[PDB]
Design a protein around this ligand. Sequence first.
Ligand SMILES: OC[C@H]1O[C@@H](O[C@@H]2[C@@H](O)[C@H](O[C@@H]3[C@@H](O)[C@H](n4cc(CCC[n+]5ccccc5)nn4)O[C@H](CO)[C@H]3O)O[C@H](CO)[C@H]2O)[C@H](O)[C@@H](O)[C@@H]1O
Length: 429
Amino acid sequence: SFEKTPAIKIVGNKFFDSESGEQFFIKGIAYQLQRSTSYIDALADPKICLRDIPFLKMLGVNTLRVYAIDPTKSHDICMEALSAEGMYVLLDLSEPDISINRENPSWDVHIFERYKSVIDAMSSFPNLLGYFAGNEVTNDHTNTFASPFVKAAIRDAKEYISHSNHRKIPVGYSTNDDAMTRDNLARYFVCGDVKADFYGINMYEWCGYSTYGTSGYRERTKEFEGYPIPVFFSEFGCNLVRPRPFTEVSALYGNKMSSVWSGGLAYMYFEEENEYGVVKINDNDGVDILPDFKNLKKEFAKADPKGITEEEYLTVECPHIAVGVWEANEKLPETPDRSKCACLDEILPCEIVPFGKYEEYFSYLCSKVDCSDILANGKTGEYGEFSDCSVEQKLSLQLSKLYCKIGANDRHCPLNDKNVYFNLESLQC
Ligand SMILES: OC[C@H]1O[C@@H](O[C@@H]2[C@@H](O)[C@H](O[C@@H]3[C@@H](O)[C@H](n4cc(CCC[n+]5ccccc5)nn4)O[C@H](CO)[C@H]3O)O[C@H](CO)[C@H]2O)[C@H](O)[C@@H](O)[C@@H]1O
């Protein structure tokens, strides 16, 4: 049963409860456990989530941000338990080992399959608020060319959801707060023919007992006034001054900011040797409440954002390219084609299995054959025909091209490595 969490929908630049029609404001906290899979999925483990939900209820949150789930595991126990307390989930589609790499960006079948798997695992829950298609991918002026790959991911996640039987859960983006790139990033993700459905900023400008004017919150609010999609703080809670008073919460849900922002999520629930937690899990797996907890609790309790209803509410150019400043082309890479890339597994004479060596093997093979067909350039908007295939498929293509160039036809692939093998399926889309 999900009566207490009706699905939230987007109209214009605001969230709305689909039943009542009241504006939905996010009063949230990040909820994600680490190790000392690589990620831990707290929503796949009832003993973890059912321990914490009572404490989350005390905080008075209506939303969690979760950065990683294991899509092979069940989540209905934790998601229904969250729904029981009126709590929604914002969920990143990526994870640390399967993300768009800001140092070498690609939008490919491997990353897209990860996104699909999370979508298929989590879309049945009415309290799934939205998906993030990326988190701080571009983070400064040196990697703005990663952003077209994220926009392609937004488009393709939205289309995948559209073509599924699922509820059309919105797909957005979470960005950092770098001064040189923030205005261009915000414009880029709503420009042209592809748009993020919502926009989260990881916002740490307000530290200690600051103010609306002095923190920078006033300038941010004036910048995002009239922004065409919902905007919120996907993270907040600068910890320079402790215990964190969380006085930004009073500003965030006040009348000046509540007209522009759709709330935000504190970072975070768990303490992980970083002084960002509101609780600490002890050696007996029990929850010890930390000094920040009471301050966030009081601030959320006092917050009462005056929104507008759905019915009364009902009544862009991409940034130009400039070298060293903004290098994200409007032209996006194509939708990764699993069938095309899977046909390389069939027909290619020389293949390499996944298991440092990528840099060496690409450097070696791309000096002997033309690797243009696997390159992807977000600056120039030039995307090779097989640039959407997996790193292994890309490598295999180049090895196979070298094999055909030599033309011995003796089943000896021209790269001595144990991961290399001659594909017997090639001899038989
Ligand atoms: O796509 C961009 C990059 O994504 C990386 O993975 C991603 C990963 O780094 C990210 O990690 C977040 C991490 O960004 C977030 N976090 C918050 C903070 C506090 C920052 C404090 N602070 C204070 C003041 C100013 C600025 C900052 N520190 N870390 O904490 C989350 C839960 O603890 C954690 O999961 O989570 C994503 C989703 O799962 C992965 O997609 C990949 O590993 C990189 O290869 C890739 O380049």
